[PDB]
């Protein structure tokens, strides 16, 4: 899969819309801290309910983006 | 390519490096929404590559067109992207919009002046239903029985000051889905019956349900009478 | 390429392939740069320079003022003989009752009083269309006219022909019964 070691979350968040169809945008507060851990993209939509218990943020999928806040 | 290629000021800023060939520039995109994280749309003769930072929403209300009807309009303009379809809901007459800002504002404007147009245009189809009565005359008879001047009501003049005014539509005889509730939501007051004597007929207007639907009144309200002798 | 505009422009009384044959006639038309179309829709959709974007805005605008002046609706007469019954309304003098027959021309007269309406389906070019099945039913003017025992009928093109679909069905041969 992919490890993320102490990089940025508007990299770690734009890697997400590197591999799946429908593209990932979020927010200012969103794209400011980072994450260390075994996070893979297997499943985009099963990932972001594991990171709302390790980041503490919010995500919306309506059918064609993610819109992931603070 | 032959169409030309229009991007924005932060679409033309990053950089890249790998192989892209542009044998195909349509779909060269879809791996470029993979690799360098942009937005694009190919509206038939130009590519508008936008951010993907820059997407905005929007909530567009629908008036005169259904969730169904308005998206194969679409199809047959051409200007439809399937990478991005809109969003429906089959019991509200709006629909929710995602993409560059362009094709964004673009769709905004179009159910704007898809509803101003079918304002102008008219649903109602009125249909003219002829019944042939069997068990009674038509028309207000009256017995001249020189005890009292009785006066006896017919068809075309009971059922026609029942439905006097009354705003409404009307119902179930006891003894596409906006495309439908706008026809059954016709004013019962709007049925006007004439009757017709020398072909013992009667003559009723409706919306294409209720002609149809006066006349399960009216079979079941004109039975053969019966013969009573006396001594 | 960069000051390339857009522009969404509605359409009255012009239809999508009504304005498209329009630009191949003036000879300003851009066959690199078509315009978008919607079939149900009374609109279109412009890109290119912004000379031929803002041209074609203000083309849209000065065709729609043209034929808001023009009408579209012709009216047509009809005139139906009648054959199984009179024309105009007979009273019979009985000494009992003062009864009274209405004929054709004042039943159906009487039934499509007012009524800002189209009408349908007797039961016993798509906005050029839909502007001329939008005529109002309250339109039709029906005058007997008994020294030919035939009516005068008015309306546009269709209703004409819809009523005499009713007046058809509607004087059937009368038929004999004899007493004793």
Do not use: C
């Not at chain 2, 929007?58 to 809109?86: D, I, M, T």
């Not at chain 2, 009501?153 to 706008?182: D, F, H, K, Y």
């Amino acid at each position: 899969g992919f490890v993320a070691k102490d990089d940025s979350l508007r990299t770690f968040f734009d890697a997400m819309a590197l591999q799946l169809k429908e593209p990932v945008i979020v927010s200012k507060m969103a794209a400011r801290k980072k994450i260390t851990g075994n996070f893979e993209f297997h499943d985009p939509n099963a990932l972001l309910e594991k990171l709302s218990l390790q980041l503490g943020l919010i995500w919306y999928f309506d059918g064609q983006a993610i819109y992931i806040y603070d | 390519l032959k169409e030309p290629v229009i991007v924005s000021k932060m679409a033309a800023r990053k950089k890249i490096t790998g192989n892209f060939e542009f044998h195909d520039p349509n779909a060269l995109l879809e791996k470029l929404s993979l690799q360098l994280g942009l937005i694009w749309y190919f509206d038939g003769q130009a590519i508008y590559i936008y951010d993907a930072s820059e997407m905005r929403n929007a909530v567009v209300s629908l008036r005169n067109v259904s969730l169904n009807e308005f998206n194969n309009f679409l199809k047959r303009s051409g200007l439809y992207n399937k990478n991005y379809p809109l969003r429906g809901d089959n019991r509200k007459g709006t629909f929710y919009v995602s993409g560059p800002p362009v094709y964004v504002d673009m769709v905004v404007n179009a159910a704007t002046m898809m509803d101003k147009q079918n304002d102008g245009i008219e649903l109602g189809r009125q249909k003219i239903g002829v019944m042939r009565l069997n068990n009674t005359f038509v028309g207000d008879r009256t017995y001249n029985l020189r005890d009292q001047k009785m006066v006896i009501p017919g068809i075309a003049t009971a059922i026609e000051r029942l439905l006097q005014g009354e705003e409404q539509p009307l119902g179930n005889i006891v003894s596409m889905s906006l495309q439908e509730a706008l026809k059954q939501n016709a004013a019962a007051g709007n049925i006007k019956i004439v009757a017709y004597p020398d072909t013992n007929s009667l003559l009723v207007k409706g919306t294409a349900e209720q002609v149809h639907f006066i006349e399960m009144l009216v079979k079941a309200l004109d039975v053969a009478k019966r013969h009573v002798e006396l001594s």
